[PDB]
Structures are given as structure tokens and as C-alpha cells.
Ligand binder design. Sequence first.
Ligand SMILES: CCOC(=O)CNCc1ccc(-c2cn[nH]c2-c2c[nH]c(C(=O)N[C@H](CO)c3ccc(F)c(Cl)c3)c2)cc1Cl
Length: 347
Amino acid sequence: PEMVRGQVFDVGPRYTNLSYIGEGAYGMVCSAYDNVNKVRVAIKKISPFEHQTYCQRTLREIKILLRFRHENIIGINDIIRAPTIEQMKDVYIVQDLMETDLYKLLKTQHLSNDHICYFLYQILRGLKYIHSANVLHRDLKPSNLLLNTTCDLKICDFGLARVADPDHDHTGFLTEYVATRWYRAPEIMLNSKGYTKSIDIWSVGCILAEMLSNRPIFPGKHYLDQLNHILGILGSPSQEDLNCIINLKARNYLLSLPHKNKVPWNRLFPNADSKALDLLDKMLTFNPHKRIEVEQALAHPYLEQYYDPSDEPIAEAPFKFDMELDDLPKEKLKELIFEETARFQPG
Ligand SMILES: CCOC(=O)CNCc1ccc(-c2cn[nH]c2-c2c[nH]c(C(=O)N[C@H](CO)c3ccc(F)c(Cl)c3)c2)cc1Cl
């Protein structure tokens, strides 16, 4: 059994010639050669069974990606694990191999407008499929956008994905949140649990702004600082947008702040395409109900060179979890993971 950087990586005999790529909070990804299809792939070893959280994220991703099939969404083509639950200590998921990701590119590469336009299109094309299945990604960011040498884009990491639930999205002021801070919509810190498709659109807007300048637009250092960054550029919310926030603690916090004017997009991004900034403004709308939707975004003039709704497929049916995974012990989650992966065993 070959191992990579002092950690067991038993995936043979089908997959060999391992090579390290990255390491996560509870797993490792390596490139391997597939002896059946005779092509290299990406294998993510997971060791989640010691924490309920890691089990929930694992199961959510497996169930969703086995039902999804889209050029701009990472796939699960095989799953390796022990033949019995007693022997199953880790789980290996075989996925698309991709040379780089948008986080790496932005660190060192200036993106031409054509590249920014093409990246944004694929993101939104993938997101259209996700949202058509009534699913939310909830952690879109450059590091979760993989790319190959011809700049084909695939969205990955569905650990925080959920089924949309707009009727149960309201919550109190300063409610804790898991997803990455720099890409959280302002309503997360005010009165939202992130159960609406509009929180993904905000994240895409942050990604667009980051592609324009090679730096995050709202780099908050802590929870509430994230909101103050957003308000520093968008300016004070209008009376109309404030009235939609019925929670008094949230509204009164906003009312306690000095008046701040809107920072014009053309001053923040002097070299950006004018149509790109118009679409950015619509994705980074303070009011989530006025924020642009994914299909509307794909039809925006900035993407006219690529827009083709007949070549932007949707899911064949909405997604629905068989049971709520928010209150299940790590032990039972291991069973469900064992069941969802049974179809990939040799027997
Ligand atoms: C905590 C996030 O992980 C990191 O440390 C930074 N990502 C580096 C990376 C960069 C590219 C690739 C890669 C290259 N080709 N295919 C993949 C790939 C295949 N699957 C995944 C994936 O699921 N990534 C997510 C994060 O986006 C993930 C989720 C959970 C994890 F434990 C790990 Cl290690 C990774 C990535 C893999 C990796 Cl691990």
C-alpha cells in the first residue's frame, strides 16, 4: 500500500503512481493513474468518521455530485473504501484532475478581460445547473474553482451545499456562519441563514471583483468587519432596503453608522470593462431580493459572446435529501456513507 507524505493512501490496484496535490481540514488529494481508463485522475482521501461535521460535509457532497452531471461541475466517477463498515476507516473519491485553480492564478497571473469574461460565464453556467436542482453551493470562492491548461472551469467542494429553503432563511443579528468570510453576503451578518440562491450570487460577485484587481474586494478580518467592508464600498443602505430588515437589532446597528457614500465601481476598477462593472453592481446588490439571478446574469450584455440558453442545461429534477443531516450522530452518518458508496464496490 503506497502512501503520500506520511499518510496511508490505499487505492490500488486500479489507481497507482500517486503524487501529492493538496491537503484539507480532514482529507488529502493526490493525482493517480487510472489503469482502467488509462488516464490520470484526482483522488480525495477522506477521514471524517471522528467528527459529525466532517461526516455531514462528506455525505452531502457524495449525494449531490453523484446526481449532478455538468461540464462546469466536478464529478465523482468512482469511490474506493473497505468492503465492510467495520474495516472502513477512510473514503476515497475519484474526481476530475485539473492543473490549477482560480486562487493560484490570481496570486500571480493578470487576467485579460476575455479571460475574466470566459471564467465568469462558466461559473454562472455551472451555477445555473446547481440552482435548477434547487441546490445552493454556499462556499463559492476562487480556491473552489478548478481550471485546466485550456482554462476550462469546474466548481468543486459541495461540503456546505444545501437545498434551498427561502421560507426558513430569517434569523437574528450576528448569527454565526460557517462559509468563507470574504465571500459572505451582507445579510448573513444581519438576518439570513444563507438558505436562498441569492447568497451564491453575492459570492460570484466577489469573485468577479477579485478577478478584476487580483485581490479580494471585501477582506474582512473578523465577523462584523466583513459587513463594514461591504458598507464601505456600497454605502449606507437606502431607506427601502432598511425597511426590509425587520429585526430591530440588525436595523438599529445599520442606523447607528455614519452616512457613507457609494464608492463608484469605475473608481475601484479603472481598467475594467464597463459592461463587467454593470453586472458586478447587480450581483453585489445589498438587498438580496433585488440581487440579480443566475439566469438573468447569463443574459447580461457582458456575456453576450457566450450566452446561449439552449447550451446551458438544467438538472432533470430538483434535489431532495431523504432525511435532515443536521441532527444525526457520526455513527449513523458512517452507515449512510457506506450505503451511498456501495454501488462502486466490485461486488
Ligand atoms: C482545504 C482545501 O484544500 C486545500 O488545502 C487547497 N486546495 C488545494 C487543491 C487544489 C486542487 C486540487 C485538485 C486538482 N485536481 N482536482 C482537484 C480536486 C479534486 N477534488 C477536490 C476537492 O474536493 N477540493 C475541496 C476544496 O475545494 C476539498 C474538500 C475537502 C478536503 F479535505 C480537501 Cl483536501 C479538498 C479538488 C486539490 C486540492 Cl486539495
